[PDB]
């Protein structure tokens, strides 16, 4: 029985998600193309010349779907399960994540400022909802929390002024505060712990996050996968329904599951009969994102007592260039050579926030010294660096309207643009979301489902847990 030809571009979690579902269904007429030598995309891991494994920034596995959990169990045996121990370095103190719920750990005067400003913003009411993320967190948390944490931290990570960001992506990312709880915490010095979908997470014992997608790759039919730099897609002809690669090859498709960046897709896709086609270049120009610099510092010995069981740490202040540090050796003993530990640092970059790359590593090290991560006597054996051009899809004001101008037109022509940058929706931008966007796209294409829940209803997916199992486990 011959079936429509499905081509997948990209072997990150989204693409592999589509491939896995097809495999589960026993579908035969499909092929996946990837221009990297290795599966995983932004979820790959790297082994440096000194024996240190690196992820591309802190990655931890936590799932909103039974399906993805099953896939993880199926792909990888040997998981470490950890309770999140995450902190914020601010005003000379270690404050438990989330900052806003734990202001009792601030020095007295900062704590008083945070509480008082929180009381004052409770006393202020408004006719209309906030127009942007900054107005939103300022009204919600008060000027104390905003000044000490929300504003400097959010610029430091997003590399975009938060006043240019929308407000509805925050549901599972920005914890709310309760004034009565906060006052009680202050009376009792009682930490407020365990908030959020990654309060518990898991991480592979060996090979970093990338081992997951390597194992997945090895489970799929090898003949249906292509990993080669010549297979970078550089033109989509939607009339002829072909994909032209950088090596000059041309292949046809009935359906295209594209996980390349949405801006890249719009600029390389040509055809007739697309409504609004002439606007595509302006749409692509308006898609806001930040780049991500990953710096891996390998250190002799063992981490200091205050970092013994730390996971990831946040740095709102200008004494460090990185917004986050991960004690990556605490996820697995095998991420480092014996007798060492490691810090994985993240520095954002954009048009609003340029980076001097020639001084970046040394600046990170100076930042570690100033932020209680390293001491002058620490011995550094590895200084790894990796720059991601497209790191975060900014939830910028106007994003949905831009997306709605092209996405339904692409889909009506059998082109499904999905994943972290394929759909450009940060709030469903993690590994489980991405993987499931691939699974769901296949379901839609094959008529098993009438809608794609994850990419279309971020609120629904993150408010519940999907219960359906993965059959190959
Ligand atoms: C700093 C940082 C930190 C985190 C995370 C990201 C980043 C940058 N993530 C998000 C996670 O990385 C993400 O959800 C997935 O990698 C996205 O999956 P995709 O397949 O959508 O994109 P992704 O970028 O992964 O994959 C796309 C693939 O398509 C390929 N491609 C692009 N253009 C092509 C072309 N023209 N031709 C052929 N191939 C092409 C690329 O090479 C790439 O391999 C995360 N998630 C999580 O669950 N927990 C976490 O803690 C984190 N933390
Ligand atoms: O103590 C904190 C730390 C972070 N955030 C917010 O949570 C968002 C998500 O950050 P996180 O490290 O959860 O996600 P990631 O950067 O990995 O996408 C950030 O942009 C912050 O605005 C917060 O409200 N309180």
**CB atoms closer than 10 angstroms to residue 187:** 9
**CB atoms closer than 10 angstroms to residue 62:** 17
Ligand 2 atom 8 nearest Cα: 173
Omega of the bond leading into 98 within 30 degrees of 0 (cis)? yes
State the closest ligand 1 atom to the C-alpha of 433, by its place in the atom list counted from 1: 14
CATH code of 1-473, in short, is 3.50.50.60
The answer to whether 99 is annotated as binding is yes
- C-alpha 446 – ligand 2 centre gap (Å): 37
Ligand 2 mutation target, pool 173, 316, 427, most atoms within 8 A of CB: 173
User: Tokens for 208?
Assistant: 């970093």
Burial class (CB in 10 A: 0-12, 13-18, 19+), 82: middle
- C-alpha 102 – ligand 1 centre gap (Å): 32
In whole angstroms, give the CA distance from residue 219 to residue 227.
15
Q: What angle do CA 391, 67, 450 make, to 5 degrees?
A: 85
What's the first-to-final CA gap in the chain, in angstroms?
A: 26
Give me the sign of the Cα torsion angle 390, 395, 398, 400. Answer: positive
In whole angstroms, give the CA distance from residue 314 to residue 123.
30
Burial class (CB in 10 A: 0-12, 13-18, 19+), 170: middle
Resolution in A: 2.2
Q: What angle do CA 409, 443, 417 make, to 5 degrees?
A: 35
Cβ–Cβ under 8 Å, residues 219 and 74: yes
Virtual CA dihedral for 116, 190, 310, 386, nearest 10 degrees? -20
The answer to whether 14 is annotated as binding is yes
In whole angstroms, give the CA distance from residue 134 to residue 434.
27
In whole angstroms, give the CA distance from residue 416 to residue 430.
18
Ligand 2 atom 5 nearest Cα: 174
Cβ–Cβ under 8 Å, residues 24 and 216: no
User: Tokens for 173?
Assistant: 């990312």
The answer to whether 34 is annotated as binding is yes
Cβ–Cβ under 8 Å, residues 219 and 473: no
Q: Does the beta carbon of 32 lie inside 6 Å of ligand 1?
A: no
- C-alpha 41 – ligand 1 centre gap (Å): 5
- C-alpha 422 – ligand 1 centre gap (Å): 10
H or E, element range at 269: strand 269-270
Beta carbons within 8 Å of 138's beta carbon, 6+ residues apart:
121, 130, 146, 150, 151
**Nearest one of 68, 105, 92, 140 to 435, comparing CA atoms:** 68
Ligand 1 atom 28 nearest Cα: 10
Virtual CA dihedral for 303, 306, 307, 311, nearest 10 degrees? 170
User: Tokens for 7?
Assistant: 């081509």
**Nearest one of 251, 288, 282, 289 to 267, comparing CA atoms:** 282
**Nearest one of 15, 64, 7 to 439, comparing CA atoms:** 15
Beta carbons within 8 Å of 199's beta carbon, 6+ residues apart:
83, 84, 193
DSSP for 169-208?
A: T-TTTS----HHHHHHHHHHT------STTSEEEEESSS-
Task: For tokens 């505060």, name the residue.
Answer: 177
Beta carbons within 8 Å of 22's beta carbon, 6+ residues apart:
6, 30, 442
H or E, element range at 252: strand 250-252
Domain ranges within the chain, ordered by starting residue: 1-473
**Nearest one of 387, 408, 385 to 456, comparing CA atoms:** 408
Q: Does the beta carbon of 15 lie inside 6 Å of ligand 1?
A: yes
Q: Does the beta carbon of 89 lie inside 6 Å of ligand 2?
A: no
DSSP for 97-121?
A: SSGGG-GGGS-HHHHHHHHHHHHHH
Q: Does the beta carbon of 100 lie inside 6 Å of ligand 2?
A: yes
In whole angstroms, give the CA distance from residue 440 to residue 411.
14
User: Tokens for 255?
Assistant: 């359906």
Method: X-ray
Ligand 2 atom 20 nearest Cα: 154
In whole angstroms, give the CA distance from residue 296 to residue 158.
20
The answer to whether 233 is annotated as binding is yes
Beta carbons within 8 Å of 322's beta carbon, 6+ residues apart:
295, 315, 345, 346, 347, 364, 367
Read off the DSSP letter of residue 328: G
DSSP for 122-134?
A: HT---SS--SSHH
> Phi and psi at residue 239, in whole multiples of 5°?
-80, -55
């Amino acid at each position: 029985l011959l079936t429509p030809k499905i081509v997948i571009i990209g072997a990150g979690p989204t693409g592999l998600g589509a491939a896995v579902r097809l495999t589960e269904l026993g579908y035969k007429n499909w092929h996946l193309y990837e221009c990297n030598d290795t599966p995983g995309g932004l979820s790959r891991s790297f082994l440096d010349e000194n024996g240190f494994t690196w992820d591309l920034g802190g990655h931890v596995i936590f799932s909103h779907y039974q399906y993805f959990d099953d896939v993880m169990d199926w792909a990888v045996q040997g998981w470490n399960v950890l309770q999140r121990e995450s902190w914020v370095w601010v005003r000379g103190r270690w404050v438990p994540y989330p900052f806003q719920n734990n202001i009792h750990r601030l020095p007295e005067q900062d704590r008083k400022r945070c509480l008082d400003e929180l009381v004052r913003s409770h006393a202020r009411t408004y006719t209309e909802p906030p127009n942007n993320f900054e107005e939103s967190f300022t009204r919600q948390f008060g000027e104390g929390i905003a000044d000490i944490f929300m504003r400097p931290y959010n610029f430091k990570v997003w590399a975009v002024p938060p006043c240019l960001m929308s407000t509805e992506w925050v549901e599972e990312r920005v914890a709310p505060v309760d004034l009565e709880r906060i006052r009680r915490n202050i009376q009792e010095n009682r930490d407020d712990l365990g908030w959020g979908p990654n309060a518990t997470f898991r991480f592979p014992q060996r090979g970093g996050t990338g081992i997951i997608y390597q194992a997945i790759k090895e489970k799929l039919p090898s003949e249906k996968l292509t990993f080669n730099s010549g297979f970078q897609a550089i033109a989509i002809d939607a009339d002829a329904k072909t994909i032209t690669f950088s090596n000059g090859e041309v292949v046809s498709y009935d359906y295209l599951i594209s996980t390349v960046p949405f801006d890249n897709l719009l600029r390389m896709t040509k055809g007739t009969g697309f409504k609004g086609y002439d606007e595509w270049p302006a749409i692509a120009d308006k898609m806001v994102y930040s780049s991500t610099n990953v710096i891996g510092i390998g250190v002799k010995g063992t981490p200091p007592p205050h970092l013994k069981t730390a996971c990831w740490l946040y740095f709102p202040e200008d004494t460090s260039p990185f917004y986050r540090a991960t004690v990556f050796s605490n996820y697995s003993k095998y991420n480092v050579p014996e007798g060492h530990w490691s810090l994985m640092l993240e520095v954002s970059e954009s048009k609003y926030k340029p980076v001097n790359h020639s001084t970046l590593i040394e600046d990170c090290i100076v930042g570690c010294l100033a932020s209680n991560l390293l001491l002058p006597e620490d011995l550094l054996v590895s200084k790894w660096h990796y720059r991601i051009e497209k790191g975060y899809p900014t939830p910028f004001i106007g994003r949905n309207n831009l997306l709605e101008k092209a996405q339904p037109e692409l889909m009506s022509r059998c082109i499904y643009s999905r994943g972290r940058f394929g759909a450009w929706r940060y709030e469903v931008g993690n590994q489980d979301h991405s993987f499931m966007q691939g699974v769901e796209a296949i379901d839609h294409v094959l008529g098993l489902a009438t809608e794609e829940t994850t990419v279309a209803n971020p609120g629904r997916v993150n408010g519940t847990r999907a219960t359906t199992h993965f059959g190959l486990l």
